[PDB]
């Protein structure tokens, strides 16, 4: 390994691929040469791996201390700059050890190079190359699972042994909430002990790959209380781990749940999906116009209540009327707008009959122009709702889904409320149900449901709000005649 690497010199060189090849080859050959040593204690054991050795990376004259592994990851993920021959500013550098940030880095790549098909091709090649190297890492470094792995930690760390052999207090004073509290306390400790020791499972716990909390703790520490066929919690808990064994009484309780899961999946077959065709019919014709400003009045602009942090997130990449001026993009990160009703250009109120403008739709105009805007909205709402209804049957959690349907498919709330009240009710219903949709898509659905009593499309520029009547999704299709 060399100890000084110039980033934009290699990226803008014509030897970019050869440099990655030899580093990639060098890292995997090192891993094949040596074993990984485990101490099963807080004082980790020493390993001589090149990926963990440090190099100095020079970005536009600034030196950052970066591991050899972070270097080869950076080169693979900086392929755009070799292709476009545009250097990498220091703004674009990110933490290469937290894989969560990669997603956001790809997002900045899309905005910088213009959401083009060319940058879309390079990101695909970056995801491909990153995955192929992961297999080489995995087949050379190796990954395993064993009960001896658990035993080896507990022999040094008494807390692991005590948690691996934990048994609930037999006080009758314990209750379902108390037992569930002990479940989190000992499980949160278990995951911490695994992250802070040199064990064969450390990389699993820190990466988040192949780890589910509940099921991990049942194998290692304690199963807990379990529901019966109809949801009532059975008075007796399962005070063992799967690794230690089960009791005959406990075996019946598990079989009850497994049977209940099977019965539930038989009931889960129901999938009406009637609304999917209705919503698609109204919204398929809605299109976009390359007109920056349709022309609308601020009182005709939609007013929305930012009651929760969830509300501002729905309105990103959209316009907002600042108190000092007008028509500035709302920053979702600023919590100053929380608790303030704000005036927003809406696709509902766009004047042009042909399509919705660039200010009312939002900054997603150039991003989603290639696809059908209405069909984008119907799928963003249908796929969660269809999935959420089925997932809720397994567990007031089901109620938001019903009210969402009633809002758009019945005239219960449509006939006696305004659009400003209708859209805000929609975002309230989505927030409670957990559906994550940007409000522009939900408003487009309401826009077609909204049918003008006045029957004039371009009257929106008039300061007076046009006379209108919202309609039910099936009735609006019927109103066409």
């Amino acid at each position: 390994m060399e100890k000084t690497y110039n980033l934009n010199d290699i990226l803008l060189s014509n030897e970019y691929e050869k440099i990655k090849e030899d580093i990639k080859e060098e890292i995997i050959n090192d891993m094949a040469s040596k074993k990984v040593k485990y101490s099963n204690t807080s004082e980790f054991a020493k390993n001589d791996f090149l990926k963990d050795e440090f190099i100095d990376l020079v970005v536009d004259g600034e030196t950052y201390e970066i591991t050899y592994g972070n270097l080869i990851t950076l080169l693979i993920v900086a392929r755009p700059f070799n292709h476009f021959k545009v250097p990498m500013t220091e703004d674009l550098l990110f933490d290469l050890s937290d894989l969560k940030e990669y997603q956001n880095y790809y997002t900045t790549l899309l905005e910088h190079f213009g959401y083009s098909n060319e940058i879309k091709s390079i990101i695909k090649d970056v995801i491909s190359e990153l995955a192929i190297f992961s297999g080489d890492i995995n087949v050379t470094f190796g990954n395993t699972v064993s009960i001896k792995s658990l035993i080896d930690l507990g022999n040094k760390v008494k807390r692991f042994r005590e948690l691996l052999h934990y048994r609930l207090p037999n006080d009758e004073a314990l209750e379902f909430n108390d037992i569930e509290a002990i479940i989190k306390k000992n499980l949160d400790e278990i995951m911490k002990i695994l992250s802070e020791t040199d064990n064969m499972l450390r990389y699993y716990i820190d990466s988040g790959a192949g780890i589910n909390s509940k099921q991990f703790g049942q194998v290692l520490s304690l199963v807990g209380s379990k529901p019966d066929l109809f949801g009532k919690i059975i008075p007796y808990p399962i005070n063992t781990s799967f690794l230690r064994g089960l009791d005959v009484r406990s075996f019946y309780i598990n079989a009850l749940g497994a049977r209940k899961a099977l019965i539930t999946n038989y009931q889960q077959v129901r999938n009406s999906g009637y609304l999917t065709r209705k919503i698609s019919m109204l919204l398929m014709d809605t299109k976009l116009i390359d007109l920056d400003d349709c022309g609308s009045h601020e009182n005709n602009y939609l007013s929305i209540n930012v009651e929760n942090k969830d509300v501002l997130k729905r309105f990103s990449k959209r316009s907002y009327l600042n108190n000092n001026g007008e028509l500035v993009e709302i920053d979702i990160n600023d919590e100053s707008l929380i608790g303030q009703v704000i005036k927003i250009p809406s696709p509902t109120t766009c004047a042009s009959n042909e399509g919705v403008c660039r200010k009312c739709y939002g900054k997603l105009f150039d991003i989603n122009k290639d696809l059908n805007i209405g069909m984008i909205a119907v799928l963003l709402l249908t796929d969660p709702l269809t999935q959420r209804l089925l997932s809720a049957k397994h567990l007031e959690l089901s109620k938001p889904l019903r009210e969402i349907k009633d809002l758009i498919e019945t005239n219960k709330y449509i006939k006696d409320h305004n659009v400003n009240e209708v859209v805000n009710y929609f975002i309230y219903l989505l927030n409670e149900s957990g559906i994550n949709i940007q409000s522009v898509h939900s408003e487009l659905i309401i826009r077609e449901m909204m049918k003008l009593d006045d029957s004039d499309r371009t009257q929106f520029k008039n300061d007076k709000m046009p006379d209108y009547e919202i309609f039910r999704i099936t009735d609006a299709n019927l109103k066409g005649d």
Binding site: L452, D453, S455, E469, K479
Partner: protein
């Protein structure tokens, strides 16, 4: 008069004639977009009665 005035009205529209024309038309036609025309036509037929 009270039956004519539903609770869901705004005082501004009371003095607007075309709103009342649309209200008259709504009884005959369900669609809210053609209401006005129907009302006007009905007025003509009303005048024909005598």
């Amino acid at each position: 008069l009270l039956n004519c005035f539903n609770t869901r009205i705004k005082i501004d529209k009371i003095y607007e004639k075309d709103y009342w024309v649309k209200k008259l038309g709504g009884y005959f036609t369900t669609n809210n977009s053609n209401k006005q025309e129907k009302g006007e036509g009905i007025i003509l037929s009303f005048e024909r009665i005598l």
